[PDB]
Amino acid sequence: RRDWENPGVTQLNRLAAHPPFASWRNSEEARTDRPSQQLRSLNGEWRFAWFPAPEAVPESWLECDLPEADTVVVPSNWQMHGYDAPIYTNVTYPITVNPPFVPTENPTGCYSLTFNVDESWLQEGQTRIIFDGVNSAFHLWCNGRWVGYGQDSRLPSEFDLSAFLRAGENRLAVMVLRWSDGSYLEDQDMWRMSGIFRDVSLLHKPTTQISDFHVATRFNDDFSRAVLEAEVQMCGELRDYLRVTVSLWQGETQVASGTAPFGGEIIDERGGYADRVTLRLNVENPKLWSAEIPNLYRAVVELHTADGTLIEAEACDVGFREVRIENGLLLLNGKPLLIRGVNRHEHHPLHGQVMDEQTMVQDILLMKQNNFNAVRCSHYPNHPLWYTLCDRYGLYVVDEANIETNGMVPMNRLTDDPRWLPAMSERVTRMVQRDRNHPSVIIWSLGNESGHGANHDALYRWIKSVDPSRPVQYEGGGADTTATDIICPMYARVDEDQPFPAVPKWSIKKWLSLPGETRPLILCEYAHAMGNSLGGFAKYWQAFRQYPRLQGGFVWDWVDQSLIKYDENGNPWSAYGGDFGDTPNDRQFCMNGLVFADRTPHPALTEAKHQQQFFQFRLSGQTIEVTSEYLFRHSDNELLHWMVALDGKPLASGEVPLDVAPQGKQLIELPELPQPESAGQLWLTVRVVQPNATAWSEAGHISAWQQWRLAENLSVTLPAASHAIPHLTTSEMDFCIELGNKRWQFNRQSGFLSQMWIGDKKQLLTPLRDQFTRAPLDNDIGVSEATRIDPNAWVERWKAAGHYQAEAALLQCTADTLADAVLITTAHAWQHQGKTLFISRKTYRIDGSGQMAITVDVEVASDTPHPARIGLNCQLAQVAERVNWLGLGPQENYPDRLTAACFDRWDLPLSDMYTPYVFPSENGLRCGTRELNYGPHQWRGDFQFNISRYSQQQLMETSHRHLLHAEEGTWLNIDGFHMGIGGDDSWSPSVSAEFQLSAGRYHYQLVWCQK
Amino acid sequence: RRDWENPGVTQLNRLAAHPPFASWRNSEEARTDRPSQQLRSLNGEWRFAWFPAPEAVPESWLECDLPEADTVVVPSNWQMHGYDAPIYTNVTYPITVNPPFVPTENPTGCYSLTFNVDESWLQEGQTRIIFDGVNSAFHLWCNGRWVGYGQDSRLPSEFDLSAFLRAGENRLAVMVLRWSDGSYLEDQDMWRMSGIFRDVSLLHKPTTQISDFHVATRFNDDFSRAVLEAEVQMCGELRDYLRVTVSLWQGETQVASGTAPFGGEIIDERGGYADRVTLRLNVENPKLWSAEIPNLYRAVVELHTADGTLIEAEACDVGFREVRIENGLLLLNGKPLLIRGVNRHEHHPLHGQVMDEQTMVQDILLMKQNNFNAVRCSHYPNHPLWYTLCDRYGLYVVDEANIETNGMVPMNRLTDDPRWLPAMSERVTRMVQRDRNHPSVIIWSLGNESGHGANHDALYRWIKSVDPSRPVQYEGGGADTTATDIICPMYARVDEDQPFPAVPKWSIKKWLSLPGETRPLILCEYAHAMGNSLGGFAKYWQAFRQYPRLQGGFVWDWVDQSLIKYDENGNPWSAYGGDFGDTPNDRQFCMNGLVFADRTPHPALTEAKHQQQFFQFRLSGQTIEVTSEYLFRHSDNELLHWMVALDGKPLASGEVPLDVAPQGKQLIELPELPQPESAGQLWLTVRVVQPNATAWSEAGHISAWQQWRLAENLSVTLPAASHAIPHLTTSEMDFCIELGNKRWQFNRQSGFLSQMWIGDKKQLLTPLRDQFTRAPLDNDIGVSEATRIDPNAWVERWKAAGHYQAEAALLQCTADTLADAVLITTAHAWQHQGKTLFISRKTYRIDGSGQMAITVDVEVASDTPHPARIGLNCQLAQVAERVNWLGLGPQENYPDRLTAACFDRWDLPLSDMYTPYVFPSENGLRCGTRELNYGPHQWRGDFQFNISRYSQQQLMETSHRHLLHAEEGTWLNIDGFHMGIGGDDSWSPSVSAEFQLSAGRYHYQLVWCQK
Ligand SMILES: [Mg+2]
Ligand SMILES: [Mg+2]
Ligand SMILES: [Mg+2]
Ligand SMILES: [Mg+2]
Ligand SMILES: [Mg+2]
Ligand SMILES: [Mg+2]
Ligand SMILES: [Mg+2]
Ligand SMILES: [Mg+2]
Ligand code: NA
Ligand code: NA
Ligand code: NA
Ligand code: NA
Ligand code: NA
Ligand code: NA
Ligand code: NA
Ligand code: NA
């Protein structure tokens, strides 16, 4: 049979799901979480062979190793080993939509392993094999005999091997199919890979054993008392001497215990469960678990005899916390959460979808270090270790079933069909059975982008009945269907409604108060971090803090799914969709992270960190008011540092410890300051520093900051007297001005400053010209494609309007000599096909001091698409090591993404002024700048700028960062104004009106001088 | 594979479920529900062979008929043909409980059929086979090639044979397994049979076809306006030229119509169902459907090209009705129902579980003629014609999923197990998909006696999402769980609580008001009609009428499940559990019907008819107030007949047309009546008669009656003197009295009347003695067995106290001669092992008129269990043809089951005075009798009696009615007092206290005379 083309068969001979087991045979090791000799890993070197279809696998493989197989590491995705290509498709299925069939050319991975077992395992007990993750479906044989089959690439599939085992060498043969009917439920937006990608193990349990256990914690009104209730189930022969004891430990101290024989309460007319027992433990003043203080206890479940012999033990970490929705609010331990969440796929640039402890830890540390307190398992149950880490390090988790049918038309075609209820059910039920005891899991999710089908309603109900301790959410079909306890839209905007038929995305503030609505609202996905993005992030935060029922959301997403490829040289580079010959593909849409694949942050990460701070501040006079947003912990590892600076120059600073209760406030009166009558703006910067290291941060970690302008002293003094006067030399073709060893040349045909010299040294490679466009950001492009243009996209709108192609017609170019200067006046019109898009009017005033003051007045046609920027650009001859500026920084910042940047004097190496987005675009801009220094040059004004060795033209024409080459000299883009970058989504225009350049008339001025 | 030992495989290659199709190619034939040339029946003669296990079937059978096969009729249950035995087990499974496995010895039925297929069916379109019922699982081969597999004995399994058939002769091969994993969900209390027991048919559909259609009817506030909405789905060639036209007809008039192209509304981000269309038809003043007036329209669903070519048409009967629960009440068309329901299994004494039109009709007529308006499909979907019939004749139906796991321990072991969710889902979903357009179905049920599992919660929700038009109910787990919209207990009593742990059965009146409860309460099963039962029926009806939220119930059950067996002589006899060698078995527990297996009524039927009347009456002076309980109809086929009689002698009578609106009242003042001087009691009897025949009844059918005592003239008349005095003659052994041609002999050693002569003919075969016991009723025995006594059962309590074996000890016997009479006085004590149980003191006064007056005063020890009766008995020498009595009748009636009986003078053949319950017991009693005539004898008094050719001893000792033998003479039991019969259930004592003989002292008197 082709069990892989039949949704009614999702497994054969598979054992029931259950929470993590180790079959410890020693209570103290179980207590300590130490290794169990009854649980062995079979990870390591296996033998593998790839085939084009299951029909090509030779029968001989069942009995013996194929000489042509290779030895490979398991776990692994075979594409990562180069056997076939990974495919990056977003919504459209990677296979023909024809349920339940799959391609007859179905890549098949034949894995095998030779192994043996302890003699005692041949003697007695049950030995099972556990495959934590096999993508997408597989058949298993042991010593040539068929064992079973399994589907669901994201949950463990276990089989009893007891009767197949033999003395000596044994051989497993695992036939893995790339595609199966399970693939119709695995349409997540990510690389499409396959293989045995999570752990493989053997677990030796007794025949009379703990087959399942559920831990629940209920509380009194003030959480000062709890009842821990643990239902324990057994398999095997019941005997009157058996007992179960459940003990609760706080570290090495036993705090509570309960023992009882098997036999549950009567539950119906036929009696009760003779094979279960529920123990109830009273716990006084329990230490509560939260992401803020992940307090944990240890529960040890022992199956033993009345007379004291242990048969076996199981165990888990227990977090005492209550999750409930009441009055429209999601409460944890009675307090309303504010979710600083992120969606996180399991992705590694070299290993594909194989997760390792080091990586998970790294991600958790970075998440916490960047003020995240929650994660959504987009969009499947994760590797088991993730939950352990989240329980211990403390992050709220949304555990999500591995069901995504995005590519169907309409999206609920399968989810509304009863024939698919069975396969879907297991993806939900087996997840709960496995994960229900992890305290970090606070919400269950039914899957993602599968429309809204009756199967969802049935499953929603099943979970609510089986585990009332956690709310259930699901975004499909409109985000507020009968299958979700939380309104949980993806990409709904803060103030702006997007009233799509059937499934509108209302402004989140409006959504809450729709007639009859009362649920809390937490975005399952928001702030699409694709390339230069995160524009408008602060808008969300502000709303979340203002509206009780807006309880946060999960950013999309943590890490870019870029894959490493190698060039002819052996040099690695980041690859995206299509880079493997995969087609159709969705190009750079797999890169939406706050961090690059290797975990290096993108600039947007700081913006997120700042907006998600846990301390709020207000300034009044000299009093700084600090407000704690923590719900549970006191600020016991924080100090406030403050500093006052005059235009970058340090004037004063100090420190004061924070001593604020959760939700409390603290007033700090700044000492009396000094009075510098020296002109300039004074600025106050405060930072919260954690003096002590923690399990997730180093000593000195900065967790929050904020700045304010203090007194300003406008300069009223006149600059020193003009020693000299510059000379004008005219030709039909140029206006040349000379001053000392300095010269400026203005082309009279083009009307631009075409050259400048310090001595005989030329300073420009390209003339100084107005610039109205930018190499488009991913948000500017959306889903627009050459092949399939989206005319509504920003980029398309600017192309169609001719912005990229308009030519500067000269309207006027004059020169006047003044008393102590030369004044050049210019006027240009940029037109397109006869339409004048923009008019720039300028004056350049060069005086005896050698400074060139530029004044620019631009007019933009009201009917042309608002332009990406309004500035000047040129290629300087010079290449200098550093960039020093007085403005916002130090990192890249844009108008709608600069709240995290601070105003001060920064100085970085030039390359730091370039942001290496894998898909290149305008980047590295810094706003609010009053002075910029590079080499001998100094520009002053109130502008935005970027500076790098790459032209806007080069960035726009180059699809991968590894292909960029430094140009001669340095490209400087100085803007009077720059359009926001947007990001509410990356497939429709998202830059908010206030960050669009629509004023029609714009003015700016700059002074260019040397030194 | 052993697919039949795997709950994960419930079918292979089976087509989707859908409502009844016929694929008409002419719309008028569809409109008329005439036969379709595209839907053929394959019922008829098939070939069959029985095997002890599937492993015994020879491979040749796939390719050709087995010479040893027999030709048999299909559909059939093979047990009915004698291949193996049917098994009658109630709760305990017929197989070892070891899910999901079955016995390796598993009776296999090999059916085959060679049949014809016309080439035209194969030139185009699709040809499918449909098996309406195969118990319990089967594999299908066509022309030697494997086609597929199916489970669920009670719904249709359809397979596409398009590619397997060829023009001309074709051969099917069906391997039917008696046991499969489906059996774990098929543990209903009925005979365990197997085979192809529902219709087999062949359906041709076009390639582009109607694959499903759902019809809904929504109304305005007063039901004066409706919108019929029909969603239609297609499969096949989707093109712009297709259209759907739905037309609605009332008779030959088209009332509405709509046409539309395919493509439903947008449902989500991926669009809508391009293969679906919803038509909405407005209908003004629709004729509403109810069980009272089953008004129907015909909807024709035409799939056609826009230019006019009908592709195919499907159609259904539509009943405009709304079902909804509001404010705690179940309403139909806005009015609260009162369910006069009955549970009905599909059972035929000769054909087993095979149903036929005639039988169904016969049952529906009798149900209606007996004032039932509702039926519950206990406990599985029914043969398809049942629904058509309830739609047309008018009965409300509870459609029930084929899920019963009663024998599990605890009962929800499988239903709370997610691994059984898929198998259960199919049973619920496919039922709804098939029966959702039938107006008769008003409530869906999740199955029966399967405890309460999370699977039920999930499924409850699925239905509520897919079909909001009908409430969902389910009794398991305590009858008021979260999986039921209706409190639907089985056997909860009216006033008496039964507080079992976990699943108590509260009094129904108390249940409605438990803190927080608001749902309506309708018993899914009540009034267990096993043997002589239905005692207490009236108590239920009084509560139902009194409490709004008590909306009725469904009696258990309609027809006894007895099977015909043939004796040596070839005479048929009714058999029950164990009569086929089947063991273990549950004996007579399969017979619980209001009617015998051949549809002959049991006496309880008339009690149900009466209590379930649709007209209530009150009498005030000579005014009769009639109140209608109809909700929607006027009494347009009814007249009131009234009659007054003096002790059975007709005095006056009349008829008055009834004209009452639904829920209305009518007052009818009767004529000045007879006030006769003559002694006796005047009795008024009124009957409601339907003058015109209907679809379900004959002209003159009586639908209701009631009686009242009017004036009573007590006799004060002295009997004239007798020209005679009886003479006494004594001896040590006897007292003999003679008077004219009459003689009486009283034995002085026994203390009883041992003989009487009329003329010179002996009148007694056994002496006249007190009797305190009865041949126990099924309700007296309950579950007690020799092998496992239930000491709480009435029969056991009487046995243990010695009632059945107590011997009369004579305490006194004297004779005295009076003025004009001889008086004999006796006293006897009945003892057991030293305990005096009862004392009987009597006097017999024989006067000169020849009458013998007997006075009896009994004492019953307060500490002995209340006795079954307090009466006398004797075997008369005479056998006479008729029995004439003045008292309640004419049918058998008991203290707690006599409301239906009317007081009058009745006269029946002797044989009618015996009720042939299959399992013999005390029977034929008539209560409230004032005079009894049999042969030359007349007895007068105020007593209850029975009279037949069978002694109480014989009835108690014989297990089956066909084994009873008429004794010499006639046994007469004349009771002063008789215990109620009970019946609230048949497994615990159920006789209400007011019907138990607990007074301690009892007095009765009779006069025995001639004529
Ligand atoms: Mg499959
Ligand atoms: Mg998606
Ligand atoms: Mg593409
Ligand atoms: Mg099966
Ligand atoms: Mg027509
Ligand atoms: Mg043709
Ligand atoms: Mg049952
Ligand atoms: Mg038995
Ligand atoms: Na909030
Ligand atoms: Na993406
Ligand atoms: Na502190
Ligand atoms: Na680019
Ligand atoms: Na009622
Ligand atoms: Na029964
Ligand atoms: Na009438
Ligand atoms: Na009997």
Swiss-Prot record, chains A, B:
User: What are the alphabetically sorted keywords of the record?
Assistant: Glycosidase, Hydrolase, Magnesium, Manganese, Metal-binding, Sodium
Cofactor note as given: Binds 2 magnesium ions per monomer. Can also use manganese. Binds 1 sodium ion per monomer.
Outcome when changing H379 to E/F/K: Essentially inactive unless very rapid purification. Causes very large destabilizations of the transition state
Give, from the UniProt record, the effect of changing G782A.
Answer: It forces the apoenzyme to adopt the closed rather than the open conformation. Reduces the binding affinity
Required co-factor? Answer: Mg(2+); Mn(2+); Na(+)
Could you tell me the EC number(s) of this protein?
Answer: 3.2.1.23
* EC top class named in words: hydrolase
GO cellular component, alphabetical, reads: beta-galactosidase complex
Positions binding Mg(2+) 2 in this chain are N585
Out of the domains of life, which is the source?
A: Bacteria
Induction, per UniProt: By allolactose.
Note the Pfam families from the entry: Bgal_small_N, Glyco_hydro_2, Glyco_hydro_2_C, Glyco_hydro_2_N, LacZ_4
Q: Which family does it belong to?
A: Belongs to the glycosyl hydrolase 2 family.
Name of protein: Beta-galactosidase
Give the encoding gene's name.
lacZ
